Curated annotation (Swiss-Prot):
Keyword line: Crown gall tumor, Cytokinin biosynthesis, Plasmid, Transferase
One Gene Ontology MF term: AMP dimethylallyltransferase activity
Protein name per UniProt: Adenylate dimethylallyltransferase
Disulfide pairings: none
One GO-annotated biological process of the protein: cytokinin biosynthetic process
Species in which this protein is naturally found: Agrobacterium fabrum (strain C58 / ATCC 33970) (Agrobacterium tumefaciens (strain C58))
Function of the molecule: Transfers dimethylallyl groups to AMP as part of the biosynthesis of cytokinin phytohormones.
Reactions mediated catalytically: dimethylallyl diphosphate + AMP = N(6)-(dimethylallyl)adenosine 5'-phosphate + diphosphate
EC number: 2.5.1.27
Transmembrane segments: none
Source organism superkingdom: Bacteria
Length: 226
């Protein structure tokens, strides 16, 4: 079968791309993302909206409570081989995501190196400045109060109740920032949603900047794929 592999940093449009190829071909898209396997952090982790899948399928490598820990990379990798393997007979599948440790498992795994055709697309960040514009938009959407899906701040407040979630969230991007930012301004995590006019602007800015650190370190640590 043909695997269409799409990887690159945070906020590069990988998913809209994947959705478009999926809506053309009919193939599912497997998310190469460990953090997105915790649906309790669906928004902050970048899962697309149901509305935005446009009836196309997107497959996650597990579905797990956040307090169970983010799915480790070698478990994710074994799950990935299985999701591709059982679909062995279909025409192709789309693998899309920005997981550093998952992509590197892939690059080191004997599974991938034979018995598949590949189309491989690597998105980059270019302008730091356009990156941050792109990033601030994405953050404002993750912050939008929506009918159907909790915002990043609402997910964050929800989970802050479980002391076990706290160290885990401190290690995840967006949430890390939001938490660091609450402590900076002597705010309770619960009050982050009612954050006043421009206080809201400094937090979007700060998360977008944390996305930047992240994307730079994704450019640093990504495998170079064949
Ligand atoms: N979808 C995501 N959302 C938020 N943070 C992420 C995401 N994927 C990776 N990270 C961050 O990058 C580290 C995970 O490594 P990796 O899966 O190898 O990129 C995580 O601990 C998070 O801090
Ligand atoms: C928010 C962070 C750090 C990762 C999730 S964003 P992404 O890799 O899901 O975004 P794109 O599909 O590249 O827009
Ligand atoms: Zn995505
Ligand atoms: Zn990071």
């Amino acid at each position: 079968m043909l695997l269409h592999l799409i990887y690159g940093p945070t906020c590069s449009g990988k998913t809209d791309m994947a959705i478009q190829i999926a809506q053309e071909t009919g193939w599912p898209v497997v998310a190469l993302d460990r953090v997105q396997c915790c649906p309790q952090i669906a928004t902050g982790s970048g899962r697309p909206l149901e509305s935005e899948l446009q009836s196309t399928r997107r497959i996650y490598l597990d579905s797990r409570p956040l307090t169970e820990g983010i799915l480790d990379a070698e478990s994710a990798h074994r799950r990935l081989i299985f999701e591709v393997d059982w679909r062995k007979s279909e025409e192709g599948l789309i693998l899309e995501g920005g997981s550093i440790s998952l992509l590197n498992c892939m690059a080191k795994s004997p599974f991938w190196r034979s018995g598949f055709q590949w189309h491989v697309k690597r998105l980059r960040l270019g302008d730091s400045d356009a990156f941050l514009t792109r990033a601030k938009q994405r953050v404002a959407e993750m912050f939008a109060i929506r009918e159907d899906r909790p915002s990043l701040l609402e997910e964050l407040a929800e989970l802050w109740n479980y002391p076990a979630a706290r160290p885990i969230l401190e290690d995840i991007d967006g949430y890390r920032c939001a938490i660091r930012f609450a402590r900076k301004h002597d705010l309770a995590i619960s009050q982050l949603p009612n954050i006043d006019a421009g206080r809201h602007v400094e937090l979007i800015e700060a998360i977008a900047n944390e996305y930047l650190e992240h994307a730079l370190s994704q450019e640093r640590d990504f495998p170079q794929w064949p």
